[PDB]
Design a protein around this ligand. Sequence first.
Ligand SMILES: [Cl-]
Ligand SMILES: [Cl-]
Ligand SMILES: [Cl-]
Ligand SMILES: [Cl-]
Lengths: 173, 173, 173, 173
Amino acid sequence: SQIRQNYSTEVEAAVNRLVNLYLRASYTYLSLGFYFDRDDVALEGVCHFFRHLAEHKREGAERLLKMQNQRGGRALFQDLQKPSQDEWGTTLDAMKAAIVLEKSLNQALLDLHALGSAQADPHLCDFLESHFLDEEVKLIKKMGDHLTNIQRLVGSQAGLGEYLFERLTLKHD
Amino acid sequence: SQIRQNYSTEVEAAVNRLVNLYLRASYTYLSLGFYFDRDDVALEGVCHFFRHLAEHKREGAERLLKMQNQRGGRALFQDLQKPSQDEWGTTLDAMKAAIVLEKSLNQALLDLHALGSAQADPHLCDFLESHFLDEEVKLIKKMGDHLTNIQRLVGSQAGLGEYLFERLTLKHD
Amino acid sequence: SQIRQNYSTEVEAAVNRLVNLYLRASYTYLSLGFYFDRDDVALEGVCHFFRHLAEHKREGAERLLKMQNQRGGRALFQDLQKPSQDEWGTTLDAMKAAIVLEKSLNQALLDLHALGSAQADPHLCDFLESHFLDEEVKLIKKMGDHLTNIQRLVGSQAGLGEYLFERLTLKHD
Amino acid sequence: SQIRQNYSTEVEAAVNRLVNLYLRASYTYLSLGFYFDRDDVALEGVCHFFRHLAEHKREGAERLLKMQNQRGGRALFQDLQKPSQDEWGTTLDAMKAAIVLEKSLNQALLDLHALGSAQADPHLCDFLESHFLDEEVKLIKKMGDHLTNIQRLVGSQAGLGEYLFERLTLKHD
Ligand SMILES: [Cl-]
Ligand SMILES: [Cl-]
Ligand SMILES: [Cl-]
Ligand SMILES: [Cl-]
């Protein structure tokens, strides 16, 4: 490569794996979004919350792919596994599955940062710090806040709580 | 007729029957709308939901009547039967009766489309596709979404659920 | 299902398969787009042409998923296979692979239309006519036009032709 | 020094050397810019490309000098060596010399970052990450893209390719 400098094969490979993890996450959120649009689920604010995350995770994958080319690495795509579930349960089940998914993406980012640190690759380390690590902390804090509110609302009338959370906390229209 | 071309007597008759079905549906929705405006029912958002459908079904009848004249058929009006009920129960009873009514209109549209297909009448088939079939799918999906939300809200406090659905889902002012 | 009417299990299944075909096509175009952004390929107009198609095919999948829910079918996601190639050759190789891909999507749309016709499902038939069949004819005509222009430009100076096509026909900036 | 804190003599010296490297690079680009403005070379877009880099490298030197004073180090200027060539050959020769020059600046930045990491100087490390490392990756990717396009255009008509690259890729007016 005419441009590649200080870019390890180990980072190049890990970036291709992280692209696969982000695209899998996007696909998971696409499935969650359409599940909440079902006529027998019908929680618009929950649908919009997950559809937006599907778009955001796709954008993350595209930013990693642009950076791979900027550093002179080569994008390599793999099979994308289907989401872990076909039906996602309650808003609470779905938000618990989301925070697990985000913790797994966050650990993949921290692992890649640690590899870049070990490889003395400060451009890679800056890149994750600037575009991913704080977006992930912010998102996990928001999901933690939502879990608390959902849990408060279950009480002895789960249906009423699920409706009120979607109407008064999540964005709809 | 100076203009009639490729327009069967069977379609002409079925169009006059469908006009009667749309006007009956409008009359049903007029009755539902004023029932929810009663001082002892008093659910404004439910009143507005049904009053709007009464106007929309009337407009459907008028579009069929305009098309009948465009094709050189002859409008023929019949007695309009009164709605099936004088009092419509809860929001849930009313929304269940509406989705039954819409399924019956949808089947009448599909039956007429099938007659036009059999008669090789593509103008009739286009007309239903363009102005009725998707409006009906969209409306039945919305009523299905509302039924799910109403059902979630019944819990052990039916009155509270009926008020919250009308205040937080349906349009009022 | 509370809303499902005149929607066959055969169409529901074929719609889920077509969603998989559109998402595979999006993934293929994502791979083509980033290949042309490589520093050793560096054809910006070709990159932008394929990146846009990746977005358009994703939007097609999302429209099919919305329609599946409108009809009361159930979205079911499968594993997404990786693209057929890791490296895509010349602009000409890439545009030949694209038109093959589009012909396969077009045949899948025509097959689904034929199934809906056989099932007397005019809403499905309208839906494909209105949002997919002409978009596909328009795209295949544009790719055919581009193939002719690329082929004219190969001459005895392939590099010069590939540069001029990307600079004077495709959109860049 | 009244302000100096956590700023090693090793970093202070390396910053003064890097200022010399940036000013030498500016001087090199000044020479490349005026060579392409010669009446017997006359490639305006190539002239403008290098004149702009001369200004950008000067600005890099000035940012390092401002930071040296912010940290309480002392600017020390050395003799500036003349550029390596008086005449720069073809656009291709010039762009190959530029990417070599940029790789040498990039390695000097990475070396200084590594020194700051070893000295536990996070302000220095942030400073390079924020203002230099990604500017350098972006520039080397752009020069790699240009090299590919120039190389594609040499064919058997080098003059025609050199003119078309300057007219259709580089900015002129
Ligand atoms: Cl799997
Ligand atoms: Cl009667
Ligand atoms: Cl495969
Ligand atoms: Cl010298």
